[PDB]
């Protein structure tokens, strides 16, 4: 029923508004038209640490930036976890499956929502008070210099689809309820829910983007690009964790950012 | 107009039959035990392999080079099919070559699923059947060659696509505007968008109770890309450790990254 699909869409939208403080609408306002403090080079970074109250700085710069990304990532996990619970049927799932879905889903969602905070020039940080430039991020040591660059490449393509929060809310739900995650015990109710969400996304896009032919298909294809980015991120993150990170980190901190 | 999309589906299915001698329909009739087709000789060990080599036509290398010869033939078929996709031959030639370069492997493993069950794979135009176990037991490098293809095939075959569906899906894959080094993405994307429309409708008409088959089919792209990457990096091993082994020019040129 159309009405029920529209109902699901509104429920998801409202839940997303509650779960995610910095929405695409808000991000887009900051980027185009207070105003963000820009970090373009070394001197601006250090000044940025004075002006902005970073929560991650624990008395090299490349590591400090990376830890900042880790801090935010861990915050995002909790926002996503809360959003998941609002999705009709999620909480009724086997508890191991819930964990499994979030375990493998959060990375894809992080980069989807990061795209909201990005343009081709840089990324909003610290609740949109900051803006770290893309160029500045590129010009870091060989490990960390290629960290965020494939996220920007993804974001530029993704943002060209010009989705809104109401679209993204349904898209994110679809990602979470993916029946193909390893270790799942009961795929039936997972795919039944995703079916329902996919139907709602379809209608949402048709109503919200009537001129954009096969936006649905295009959005589904981007999910493939997300999984590609995530596999590439993870393998890079193994080098980092093993090589340079666990050398400079406190044991407890390693536990928090164990991933 | 959905009538235009049906005509397109008809066109593509027709070109697929003409381009690909061994369809899924034929493959299934062989694998099931249907009387439209005949039974295959089964290779499950060194002995059967050797006996099979008599009837049908280092063991691990000889198998590998046979599979590579078949990949060459597949590339030829896929190239012929691509030319039939409306708009394709009108693209910049460099783009044509780039689309085939990255497209063929995703297609090869897609259509290889048609020849597979959980137990093994048809070979030599359906005359043979090589077991999964046998393939998995080969010398260390060549052992985990085919395993990921089977794992993909098991899940991909769960969709229960027929050839008509595959024809359009294969077309979608070729016309990917996200391939590295494309000169004109917009013309490619416009073709793919019409193909996607045609696929959508095809799956709704042909599989009317299979809910969100369209969305599920597109999600299988992830699995496809993974197979490719594993295969590529497996071939690098063979190049370093087996400097005696030749590689067909067509395949070299595809693998060139």
From Swiss-Prot, chain B:
Key word Ubl conjugation present: yes
Keywords of the record: Activator, Biological rhythms, Cytoplasm, Diabetes mellitus, Disease variant, DNA-binding, Glycoprotein, Isopeptide bond, Metal-binding, Nucleus, Obesity, Phosphoprotein, Receptor, Transcription, Transcription regulation, Ubl conjugation, Zinc, Zinc-finger
A GO term from the CC aspect: cytosol
Cellular localization per UniProt: Nucleus; Cytoplasm
One of the record's GO molecular function terms: nucleic acid binding
Location of region: Interaction with FAM120B: 1-46
GO biological process: BMP signaling pathway; cell differentiation; cell fate commitment; cell maturation; cellular response to hypoxia; cellular response to insulin stimulus; cellular response to low-density lipoprotein particle stimulus; epithelial cell differentiation
Consequence when changing residue 68 to P: In colon cancer; sporadic; somatic mutation; loss of ligand-binding
Residues passing through the membrane, by range: none
Binding residues for rosiglitazone: 68-71, 105, 231, 255
Domain NR LBD: 4-257
Function (record text): Nuclear receptor that binds peroxisome proliferators such as hypolipidemic drugs and fatty acids. Once activated by a ligand, the nuclear receptor binds to DNA specific PPAR response elements (PPRE) and modulates the transcription of its target genes, such as acyl-CoA oxidase. It therefore controls the peroxisomal beta-oxidation pathway of fatty acids. Key regulator of adipocyte differentiation and glucose homeostasis. ARF6 acts as a key regulator of the tissue-specific adipocyte P2 (aP2) enhancer.
Disease link: Defects in PPARG can lead to type 2 insulin-resistant diabetes and hyptertension. PPARG mutations may be associated with colon cancer.
Subunit composition and interactions: Interacts with FOXO1 (acetylated form). Heterodimer with other nuclear receptors, such as RXRA. The heterodimer with the retinoic acid receptor RXRA is called adipocyte-specific transcription factor ARF6. Interacts with NCOA6 coactivator, leading to a strong increase in transcription of target genes. Interacts with coactivator PPARBP, leading to a mild increase in transcription of target genes. Interacts with NOCA7 in a ligand-inducible manner. Interacts with NCOA1 and NCOA2 LXXLL motifs. Interacts with ASXL1, ASXL2, DNTTIP2, FAM120B, MAP2K1/MEK1, NR0B2, PDPK1, PRDM16, PRMT2 and TGFB1I1.
This protein's name: Peroxisome proliferator-activated receptor gamma
Lineage per the UniProt record: Eukaryota, Metazoa, Chordata, Craniata, Vertebrata
Gene of this entry: PPARG
Boundaries of the shown chain within the full protein: 235 to 503 of 505
């Amino acid at each position: 029923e159309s009405a029920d699909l529209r109902a699901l869409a509104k429920h998801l939208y409202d839940s997303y508004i509650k779960s995610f403080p910095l929405t695409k609408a808000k991000a887009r306002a900051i980027l185009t038209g207070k105003s963000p403090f820009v970090i373009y080079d070394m001197n601006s970074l250090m000044m940025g640490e004075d002006k902005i109250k970073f929560k991650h700085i624990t008395p090299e710069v490349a590591i400090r930036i990376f830890q900042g990304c880790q801090f935010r990532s861990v915050e995002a996990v909790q926002e996503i976890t809360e959003y998941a619970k609002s999705i009709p049927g999620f909480v009724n799932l086997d508890l191991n499956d819930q964990v499994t879905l979030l375990k493998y889903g959060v990375h894809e969602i992080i980069y989807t929502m990061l795209a909201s905070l990005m343009n081709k020039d840089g990324v909003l940080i610290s609740e949109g008070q900051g803006f770290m430039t893309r160029e500045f991020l590129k010009s870091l040591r060989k490990p960390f210099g290629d960290f965020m660059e494939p996220k920007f490449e993804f974001a530029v393509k993704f943002n060209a689809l010009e989705l809104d929060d109401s679209d993204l809310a349904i898209f994110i739900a679809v990602i979470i309820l993916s029946g193909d995650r390893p270790g799942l015990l009961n795929v039936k109710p997972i795919e039944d829910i995703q079916d329902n969400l996919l139907q709602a996304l379809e209608l949402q896009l048709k109503l919200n983007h009537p001129e954009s032919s096969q936006l649905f298909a295009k959005l589904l294809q981007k999910m493939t690009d997300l999984r590609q980015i995530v596999t590439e991120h993870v393998q890079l993150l193994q080098v980092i964790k093993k090589t340079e990170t666990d050398m400079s980190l406190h044991p407890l901190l390693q536990e928090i950012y164990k991933d």
